[PDB]
Ligand binder design. Structure first.
Ligand SMILES: OC[C@H]1O[C@@H](O[C@H]2[C@H](O)[C@@H](O)[C@@H](O)O[C@@H]2CO)[C@H](O)[C@@H](O)[C@H]1O
Ligand SMILES: OC[C@H]1O[C@@H](O[C@H]2[C@H](O)[C@@H](O)[C@@H](O)O[C@@H]2CO)[C@H](O)[C@@H](O)[C@H]1O
Lengths: 134, 134
């Protein structure tokens, strides 16, 4: 965990969290983590260019008290190394919604029944350049 | 309670940190802290509408291992309760430079000789809406 870590986010349901940043020239993997704290994540958002046996695949998971849940994978991969990218995230009682920069959108279940998101962290081959709250 | 806290900022000399946010309708005081950690601050930036015996005055200080340094006060006060505001900050070996939204700029000495800013925190009657790097 070398990237930006933010706490006291107070993101509420329906409010969009917009994260923009720079993908390394030789990016292999990058991560955006959201939740209560570092061991309790409603969203581990992990686009893998080539990491852990996945190629050009977004892997999402939850983390409950340090234990990873069951993974969800997405096919579309709107990212390129050496480029800027932007992701928007919101949530409700049921799911998190991830808005991808190619205009694609997908859902990830709110397994931990989180009513507020207080923690974000960036990791991997990504440097945050802008974080915005609606 | 404290607003947004961010660590692993990796702000280098000459790089600009842009913070935009909402001032409470009845704002009395707000704070932006920058430095290494919560006890070691190269910049405590505290516009006071009416707090601690100051009226409409920006109070700046450093904090070295929990101890406040010698205060610096600025006359101009380009802030209004209930409005959005934006501050931009950079630094070099000698000083921090604070760029105010009325176009004013002033300097605060880099007393702790910080070569990198790792930590930021918002506090008081201010809700961060956007943080951007540089
Ligand atoms: O689930 C998120 C974590 O996945 C870990 O890798 C998994 C991998 O995705 C899976 O296919 C299998 O190989 O088991 C691995 C367990 O280590 C990553 O190591 C971790 O960083 C998270 O992304
Ligand atoms: O120096 C920053 C801190 O100031 C504290 O208040 C000062 C006040 O500004 C000064 O005029 C004198 O009265 O001593 C006070 C206590 O040190 C604030 O309480 C603190 O929050 C910082 O802003």
């Amino acid at each position: 965990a070398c990237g930006l870590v933010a706490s006291n986010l107070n993101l509420k349901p329906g409010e969009c969290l917009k994260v923009r940043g720079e993908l390394a020239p030789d990016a292999k993997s990058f991560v955006l983590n959201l939740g209560k704290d570092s061991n309790n994540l409603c969203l581990h958002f992990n686009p893998r260019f080539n990491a852990h046996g996945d190629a050009n695949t977004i892997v999402c998971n939850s983390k409950d008290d340090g234990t990873w849940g069951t993974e969800q994978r997405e096919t579309a991969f709107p990212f390129q190394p050496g480029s800027i990218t932007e992701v928007c995230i919101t949530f409700d009682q049921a799911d998190l919604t991830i808005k991808l920069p190619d205009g694609h959108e997908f859902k990830f279940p709110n397994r931990l029944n989180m009513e507020a998101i207080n923690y974000m962290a960036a990791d991997g081959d990504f440097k945050v350049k802008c974080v915005a709250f609606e």
